[PDB]
UniProtKB/Swiss-Prot annotation, chain B:
Residues of the full protein shown: 245 to 732 of 1708
TM regions (residue ranges): none
Compartments reported by the entry: Cell membrane; Endoplasmic reticulum membrane; Lysosome membrane
Protein known as: Rapamycin-insensitive companion of mTOR
Function: Component of the mechanistic target of rapamycin complex 2 (mTORC2), which transduces signals from growth factors to pathways involved in proliferation, cytoskeletal organization, lipogenesis and anabolic output. In response to growth factors, mTORC2 phosphorylates and activates AGC protein kinase family members, including AKT (AKT1, AKT2 and AKT3), PKC (PRKCA, PRKCB and PRKCE) and SGK1. In contrast to mTORC1, mTORC2 is nutrient-insensitive. Within the mTORC2 complex, RICTOR probably acts as a molecular adapter. RICTOR is responsible for the FKBP12-rapamycin-insensitivity of mTORC2.
Natural source organism: Homo sapiens (Human)
PTM: Phosphorylated by MTOR; when part of mTORC2.
Quaternary state and interactors: Component of the mechanistic target of rapamycin complex 2 (mTORC2), consisting in two heterotretramers composed of MTOR, MLST8, RICTOR and MAPKAP1/SIN1. The mTORC2 core complex associates with PRR5/PROTOR1 and/or PRR5L/PROTOR2. Contrary to mTORC1, mTORC2 does not bind to and is not sensitive to FKBP12-rapamycin. Binds directly to MTOR and PRR5 within the TORC2 complex; interaction with MTOR is enhanced by deubiquitination of RICTOR by USP9X. Interaction with MAPKAP1 is not enhanced by RICTOR deubiquitination by USP9X. Interacts with CCDC28B. Interacts with NBN. Interacts with SIK3. (Microbial infection) Interacts with vaccinia virus protein F17; this interaction dysregulates MTOR.
Family: Belongs to the RICTOR family.
Phosphoserine modifications at: 21
Renumbered residue ranges of the record's region Interaction with NBN: 1-479
UniProtKB/Swiss-Prot annotation, chain C:
Domain characteristics, as noted in the entry: The kinase domain (PI3K/PI4K) is intrinsically active but has a highly restricted catalytic center. The FAT domain forms three discontinuous subdomains of alpha-helical TPR repeats plus a single subdomain of HEAT repeats. The four domains pack sequentially to form a C-shaped a-solenoid that clamps onto the kinase domain.
Organism domain of life: Eukaryota
Role noted for this protein: Serine/threonine protein kinase which is a central regulator of cellular metabolism, growth and survival in response to hormones, growth factors, nutrients, energy and stress signals. MTOR directly or indirectly regulates the phosphorylation of at least 800 proteins. Functions as part of 2 structurally and functionally distinct signaling complexes mTORC1 and mTORC2 (mTOR complex 1 and 2).
HEAT repeat segments: 14-53, 56-94
Higher taxonomy: Eukaryota, Metazoa, Chordata, Craniata, Vertebrata
Compartment(s) of residence: Lysosome membrane; Endoplasmic reticulum membrane; Golgi apparatus membrane; Cell membrane
Protein name (record): Serine/threonine-protein kinase mTOR
UniProt PTM: Autophosphorylates when part of mTORC1 or mTORC2. Phosphorylation in the kinase domain modulates the interactions of MTOR with RPTOR and AKT1S1/PRAS40 and leads to increased intrinsic mTORC1 kinase activity.
Shown residues in whole-protein numbering: 714 to 818 of 2549
Similarity comment: family membership: Belongs to the PI3/PI4-kinase family.
Amino acid sequence: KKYQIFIPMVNKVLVRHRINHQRYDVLICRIVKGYTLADEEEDPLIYQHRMLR
Amino acid sequence: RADVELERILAPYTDFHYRHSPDTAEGQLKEDREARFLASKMGIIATFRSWAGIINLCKPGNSGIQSLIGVLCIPNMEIRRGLLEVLYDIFRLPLPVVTEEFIEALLSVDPGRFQDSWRLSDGFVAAEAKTILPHRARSRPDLMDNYLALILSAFIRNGLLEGLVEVITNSDDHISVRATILLGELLHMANTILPHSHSHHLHCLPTLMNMAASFDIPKEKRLRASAALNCLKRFHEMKKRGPKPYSLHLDHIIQKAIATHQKRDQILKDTEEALLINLRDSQVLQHKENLEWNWNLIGTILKWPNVNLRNYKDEQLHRFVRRLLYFYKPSSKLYANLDLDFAKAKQLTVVGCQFTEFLLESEEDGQGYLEDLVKDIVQWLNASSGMKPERSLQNNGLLTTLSQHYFLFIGTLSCHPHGVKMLEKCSVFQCLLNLCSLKNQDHLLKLTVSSLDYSRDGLARVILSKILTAATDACRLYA
Amino acid sequence: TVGRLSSMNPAFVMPFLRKMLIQILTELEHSGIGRIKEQSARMLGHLVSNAPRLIRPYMEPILKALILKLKDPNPGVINNVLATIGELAQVSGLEMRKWVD
């Protein structure tokens, strides 16, 4: 959720140039509106190890 | 006597070649050493929990604790693995798993790890919530922390921290990881239990830091120390996060709790172009079958800020909700039959709750589709519980399938003021009231206790009162 | 700012500073660029001149790195390493005795 503060920076650029990226649209939705609690603020290395095993 | 009676128990660890029995068979010589270590370990632990043993083993002069810590620095592999298990039990810390990578060993020490007492058969939520949510005590003294503060101070005085640093940078790969976790635990324990004077020079680690920023020493030793600090730093983040919920029943309780405590303190245009592009990529239209839809793009369409089936009246969206309506229908056996180990149950369960809230937003329009869902759930309850003298035996199907994740769908509808009114039209509270007096069904009664929302007044707390006073003794204990 | 703030809440700042401190010393030796070495040395001076207590036990790894820099076989680097040694001579009283000669 630490990226949530950067949304106003990028939202200004996107509305000016009309950039619609599918994957980026998914990630921002999960941050603005809650999805779970064990997934937010998750250590990236732990997630990568979990997927590998 | 002074230094030979009590210190006898430290002989198996201090002496690399210990012979307790002068005459014994050589067949079990290897097993004899293992038995001695296990029996001696329970002796060292037992004498460190009594005041008559702590003082005698930590005398200012020569003592057994200095010999015990001093033997740790010796490059022996059999003693070091034995001593670390002792140290974990003295401080009563969870033992990590044996491995050579820090990440795997770090995931096994987190307080939010799953336990066998958290299942539906055992304590469903009450057992789980005890070890996650913190105790409501901010001023009550904890007598156990006082004991650990004195024990921790004694080891630091004798030089435990200096010994562990030597173990980390001068041992085997699977031993250093166990020592790094122990060092991380002590530092976090020392910055919240020990007074400031003892711990103001503790977090600096002068011996470990100098082995990092030194190019005169061999490069292999330097990078082992540098890698230790990076690994140790990641342990700090694990404690910073704290415990996290594991089951959605407990997760939804916390989400509603913070929401009601933040609303009392007084984004996109979403043009049809975005919806049509996203809907076509959802794959729920052209491929009329599950296991093919891209569920990542399904949740985003549901909880997108402006789309609520009311502002954007589109025929295509009416098909989209109708197509997804059939999948979650209790009668349409396309979702209830899924096993509890679908490997995507978490995503599917969240979307279902994420979907029923979408319909509730369109009060005037979505009530038509929402009324159909709630009716079949009541019919499912009348059959799964068995309140028509017919089945009375659907307990097995509920536990082994995803059919148990339906109280979440009905529980989340009780939160909103316009959702509890919808329940009265479907008359589901009456069904819940009637099933309170069911002796044979206990797992079903646990689910309804932890699913309803009791923040507001109404029939939500009426059902809870019935369960805690008119039900089975085992059921009332859980309530 | 974090250096002064470090003596107030050491449970948060110190774990991050130890990783940062090694990175500053990494650039001095490994990166053979006169601009980067000048850049890192200036940041080192701010850390010691602002949080003297934390840097006091780290005199040996830091002084030895800077001394080897002075005997390299660019005006920017010299003007900054000399200034940094000025602050290092105040934090460690009577300890910088074997390097004066």
